[PDB]
Symmetry: C2
Subunit: 206 residues, 2 copies
């Protein structure tokens, strides 16, 4: 994996954003790991989070004109990613976000939009933000999230896979389940988690 | 004024956030200038904005435990100010903001970020009325937290419906200090620096005479 991906995992771990154990997801699924970006709640967390998102964004090579952050979770993320791009990548990009109720804040919603969010659970918000992006004649360049759980949804494919299908766009993620596994495989003391995770992947993966 | 203040003024000018002319204010008055932080709509604008806010905050020397940004305007400002403090001042501070309604699917309520506790530094763009901070205050008080101060971009330093300015009501009503990066006084001092701004200096000085303080 890329250094920034490894750093993200270790940073998420230190902040208890990523926890290895046994947790019950809101789907009855017993997962051996939990991710909650909502725990990145201080200035330094935000600063670094913004750096990681910016890294994944620029590394993807996807062309976009503005960053859109869905209310409410997407707002601080879009904000920090925007400042990170400006300060560490010399890219001054327009940002925008909506009011849940004009219901828009920031620059004019125009061009190729890069939607920024934490995670795609059911795709609901994505589908909602999309009605807005389309309503303004803007197009979806891609979606940028923290972690791609790479696990089946209610059907055959995963939520990320549904979003990409329905919108002919790419979903970029800082890390995926494969990255977590690769990381665990290096930590001997994590053997139990590695077994649990790999087991979980076999049952609900891709 | 300090260098960071003059810099903010020029920053605002270049981004058309601060405009000198003749505008019919929301209150009905005809003002010689116009300020609209909403025009800080790009990544770099945000980056610099956060850095000016952080500067004024640290320079104030006021003690606070967390930054609170009111939905919706306060959210990006609180966010960038928080990152600016971390990145440029080595201060890792908890931030928090509200949702204008409770989250149906959950137990989080109407708060996002760290637990709303301690001395809160409310961050916003401008205070155009004493009634503006009420929503935030109810939330701060409902959580057993206290208001350390309010941080805004510009203090228009002009009367409202009464004899005092909106900022003066907030400080009085909540017994707190409102910090601003710049005030009307700073704009005037700046206009005196630029010989081309002579007509603007004239219009502004007169406006302050009729509505100032």
């Amino acid at each position: 994996m890329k250094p920034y991906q490894r750093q993200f995992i270790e940073f998420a771990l230190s902040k208890q954003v990523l926890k290895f154990g046994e947790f019950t997801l809101k789907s009855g699924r017993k997962s051996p790991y939990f991710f909650n970006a909502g725990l990145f709640n201080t200035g330094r967390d935000l600063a670094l989070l913004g750096r990681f998102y910016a890294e994944a964004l620029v590394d993807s090579g996807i062309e976009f004109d503005l960053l859109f952050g869905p209310a409410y979770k997407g707002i601080p993320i879009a904000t920090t990613t925007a400042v990170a791009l400006a300060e560490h990548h010399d890219l001054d990009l327009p940002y925008c976000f909506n009011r849940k109720e004009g219901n828009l804040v920031g620059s004019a919603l125009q061009g190729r939009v890069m939607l920024v969010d934490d995670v795609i659970t059911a795709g609901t918000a994505i589908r909602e933000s999309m009605e807005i992006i389309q309503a303004n004649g803007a197009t979806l360049a891609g979606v940028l999230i923290s972690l791609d759980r790479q696990e089946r949804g209610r059907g055959e494919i995963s939520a990320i896979q549904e979003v990409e299908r329905d919108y002919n766009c790419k979903v970029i993620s800082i890390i995926t389940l494969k990255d977590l596994i690769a990381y665990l495989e290096e930590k001997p003391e994590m053997a139990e988690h590695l077994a649990a995770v790999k087991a979980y992947r076999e049952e609900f993966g891709v």
